[PDB]
């Protein structure tokens, strides 16, 4: 019954390759991604207002569903829980680091 006690949270949103390339330093493994496999219609879990027949021709401007994981993990195995963030598309982990916000 309290948000602060929650271990983790997961949000699924739509992004394009341009958004990922805005900060190329942060992300990794952008090459080995199946952009078409993770299309909005191919993922019925995500609920959105985009019409079911819509795909921009430009590869950079196509929008695909991505997941994030904001939670606590024992990074060092010493028994301490520290905040982390993780992002994955399809079956590939593209970003992994600690919580950036203060």
């Amino acid at each position: 019954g309290d948000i602060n006690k929650a271990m983790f949270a997961i949000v699924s949103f739509e992004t394009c390759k341009a958004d990922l390339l805005k900060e190329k330093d942060r992300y990794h493994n952008l090459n080995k991604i199946d952009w078409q496999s993770s299309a909005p219609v191919n993922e019925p879990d995500h609920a959105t207002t985009t019409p079911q027949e819509f795909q921009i021709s430009d590869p950079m401007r196509k929008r695909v569903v991505a997941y994030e994981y904001w939670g606590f993990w024992d990074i060092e195995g010493n028994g301490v829980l520290e905040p982390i963030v993780a992002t994955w598309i399809g079956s590939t982990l593209i970003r992994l680091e600690k919580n950036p916000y203060p």
């Binding site: 997941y67 993990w73 990074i75 993780a86 079956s91 992994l96 680091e97």
Partner: protein
């Protein structure tokens, strides 16, 4: 090409970072599938 996906649902360490213990994609997906049944039941009431 380059064979198939090199890890069983990225089990073990993908080695993105230098941490001694790394999360791997399987654990995260497993927590997601664990949590999903309750959220699906809850969204029916909102609908």
């Amino acid at each position: 090409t380059d064979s198939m996906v090199p890890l069983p649902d990225p089990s073990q360490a993908t080695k993105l970072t230098s941490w001694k213990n790394e999360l791997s994609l399987q654990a995260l997906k497993a927590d997601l599938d664990a949590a999903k049944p309750s959220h699906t039941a809850m969204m029916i009431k909102v609908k």
